Amino acid sequence: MAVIADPETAQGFRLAGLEGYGASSAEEAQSLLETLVERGGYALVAVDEALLPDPERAVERLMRGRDLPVLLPIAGLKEAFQGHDVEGYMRELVRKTIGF
């Protein structure tokens, strides 16, 4: 695995039982993200909502399809955050399904 998150929160996912290779190195973590999924020698790759890639096309064009998922939303910090309910719901309705 790898979880791709903030440096300090990336820290807590490198612990045993889990395998992380996080940290920020960009504002969408491109510096890392790209290089890492290119091999696809991690069981799971996950990109948080404290980064999240504004061009998802960038990744798809480089990995060249994947049977394992990518960019699973994790919050990426704690501040009592739970806006990732309604945010993900609308993330869905904008690109697919019905409008508003």
Partner: protein
């Protein structure tokens, strides 16, 4: 160059309308089913997510300046790392909307 004949073609083109209109009728309610249930999974998804995101992090973020030298200790007692080649359990499943694989962590 390529132009349609009249006598031979007639019978094909009348049944063309029979074939098309009926086919598309039921094609219509074929995907409709699948999107209705999809709302159910997207909503329900985030239920556990708000609950367990915060109670994971609870301890994490409170073990960063008491860690960086107790990092060693914590990783030792615990069960060693998940495999990087298929540590997750991948499932294959054929379904309408093409063959898409799933998985559970």
């Amino acid at each position: 160059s390529q132009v349609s004949p009249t006598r031979m073609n007639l019978l094909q083109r009348r049944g063309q309308l029979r074939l098309a209109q009926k086919g598309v009728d039921l094609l219509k309610k074929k995907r409709d089913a699948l999107v209705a249930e999809f709302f159910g999974l997207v909503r329900e998804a985030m239920e556990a997510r708000k609950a367990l995101d915060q109670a994971a992090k609870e301890a994490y973020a409170a073990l960063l300046l008491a860690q960086a030298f107790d990092g060693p200790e914590v990783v030792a007692g615990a069960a060693l790392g998940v495999p990087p080649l298929e540590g997750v359990e991948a499932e294959v499943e054929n379904v309408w909307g093409s063959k898409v694989p799933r998985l559970k962590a």
